[PDB]
Every structure is written in structure tokens, then in C-alpha cells.
């Protein structure tokens, strides 16, 4: 019933860092498109999205419970 007493931490939601955008496609000569890491192989994935180059961990972020290679 009574008013909240002081904490010594609280922090809400992380700011989900303000990274530079699309460098995932590499151009060195045209019409060639130098892709880096493999684009996601599931049927429900569109395979136009990239997979994470996250070495010692390899994970599709479109997936959210499944498809985690690690080598």
C-alpha cells in the first residue's frame, strides 16, 4: 500500500547499440557480388537474410529457438 523504498540499481531496457548498417555485401568489381557468410538455410527462412558470422557460434537471428550451429 505504502510508497516504494529506494533501490540501488534499477535499469530498464538496453539501448540495442547504434551500429552502422549494411556492409554485409562486399563490392570489389561489378557485376560480381562478394558474399561473406552463408545465407540462412531453412524453408521458412527466405534465404535473402544473412546468418551471423559469430565464430564459435553460428546462429540465424530470424530463428528464435532453433538452428544453432556452433563450429
Amino acid at each position: 500500500k505504502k510508497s516504494y523504498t529506494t533501490p540501488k540499481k534499477n535499469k530498464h531496457k538496453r539501448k540495442k547499440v547504434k551500429l552502422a548498417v549494411l556492409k554485409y555485401y562486399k563490392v570489389d568489381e561489378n557485376g560480381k557480388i562478394s558474399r561473406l557468410r552463408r545465407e540462412c538455410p531453412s524453408d521458412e527462412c527466405g534465404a535473402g537474410v544473412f546468418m551471423a558470422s559469430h565464430f564459435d557460434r553460428h546462429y540465424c537471428g530470424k530463428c528464435c529457438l532453433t538452428y544453432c550451429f556452433n563450429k
Binding site: Y25, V27, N30, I33
Partner: peptide, 11 residues
């Protein structure tokens, strides 16, 4: 992107 968009149109 000006380079890349032409590269994607190519392929």
C-alpha cells in the same frame, strides 16, 4: 550502395 545496387541488378 551506388556500386552495390548496380551489382545486384547485374546478377
Amino acid at each position: 550502395y551506388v556500386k552495390l545496387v548496380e551489382a545486384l541488378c547485374a546478377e
